[model samples]
Target: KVQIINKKLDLSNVQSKCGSKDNIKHVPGGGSVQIVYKPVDLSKVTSKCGSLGNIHHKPGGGQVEVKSEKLDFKDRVQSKIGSLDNITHVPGGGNKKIETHKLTFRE
Candidate 1:
């Protein structure tokens, strides 16, 4: 058995590279925690292309630019609200400091 004490759904206007930096990505649904998807590794691209009209953070490397746009979403309305203290059961469990989560999102 388990007990949930508090829960939160935190939604806000997501941020993007607006001036000189570059980026991309997703914002999840309600009651879920939001996090920036940082990777242990950097991204790679096709080396088949030539650099004719762009800048590279490194030669042959690239980053997406977003000079301007409406930094918001509309179809994503029911983002976050209220709170929860719900209990749930897992198919299995243990205490490994680095455990893999086979998660299922039902929202």
Candidate 2:
């Protein structure tokens, strides 16, 4: 393991697309990477009123509670979609929108 810290990054190329879709027929445009841009909720992932009693946070206790503050983990949230293909087109190109979107939080 490495003793890491929130250091600086020359991330002038985070949004840089340098891969090819045809990486040996690796269709689906390599799908999408796990990018944490927006929050998981419509507004933002939030919670409160959690019963954090005697639950010692000693890497044990294993006390878990779902009813937190104004939590609505099942609340319908607009999904964040990642577009890998270029929508900058002309013919047959139009506003791409999510026809069907669902959110699941089980576990």
Candidate 3:
């Protein structure tokens, strides 16, 4: 069994090439918890295609293609979020993707 005692985080300015930094902390079982900070560029990714129902297509094109790029920071974030079993199994957790735009390509 997993329990989430706290999910508070602190965001502060840091001098880095990617931009700012994110500091996340979770106090579950308590004790000297280790914290790691990583930053990612989530600057509103865009795609040339759109989805309707279960189908996807380009706005004005002949073929539809899908591409993506993975960032270590994103994996780190996913790991952190995944670590929280409570948040992952919550009712709204699995449906979070339905509320956002799907990416079909990345630059």
Candidate 4:
């Protein structure tokens, strides 16, 4: 006999929780549950900064672009994985108030 179980998981919340905890098992089977942990590759994400640009001055204000090249999934699962588009940035300067922004991914 073959059986399939389906469950809805809040990936956002789960990822946050998993990030804090060390070891966790989210999937359960009949006899045993798979001990799953956040993949190390996910934690190795890197962000790059580009030339800064000035907004008002337009000459040398400064602008930065961040990108992550880490593969979220293994090669075998590439077909099943979707593009990662979440990018957050915190900006601050001398008198300028700190601001946060999210980047949008485009093709």
Off by more than 4 A, model 2 = 1-60, 69-76, 83-107
> Compared with the true structure, what per-residue lDDT tens digits does model 2 show for residues 67-86?
43453345554555565455
> TM per model?
0.18, 0.13, 0.17, 0.15
At residue 31, candidate 1 shows an lDDT of: 37
Ranking by lDDT: 1, 4, 3, 2
By TM-score, who's the top model here?
Answer: 1
Estimate the TM-score for candidate 2: 0.13
For candidate 3, write residues 18-97 as lDDT tens digits.
64444465655322345343435333334555465444534442444445454233332222334443443335455444
| Model 3 clashing residue pairs (backbone) | none
> Candidate 4 residues 13-42, lDDT tens each?
333544454534343222333533334323
- Scanning candidate 3 in windows of ten residues, the lowest lDDT window is 71-80
Query: CA lDDT of each candidate?
Result: 0.48, 0.41, 0.43, 0.44
- Tens-digit lDDT track of model 1 for 4-106: 3442336434334534333443555633343443433334555554677554556443444435443555575565646554547577677568756463545
Model 1 clash tally?
Answer: 0
Clashing pairs in 4: 52-62, 52-63, 53-61, 53-62, 53-63, 54-61, 54-62
- RMSD in angstroms, candidate 3? 25.5
Model 4 spans with C-alpha error above 4 angstroms: 1-79, 95-107
- Candidate 1 residues lying further than 4 Å off, grouped into runs, are 1-37, 42-64, 69-80, 84-107
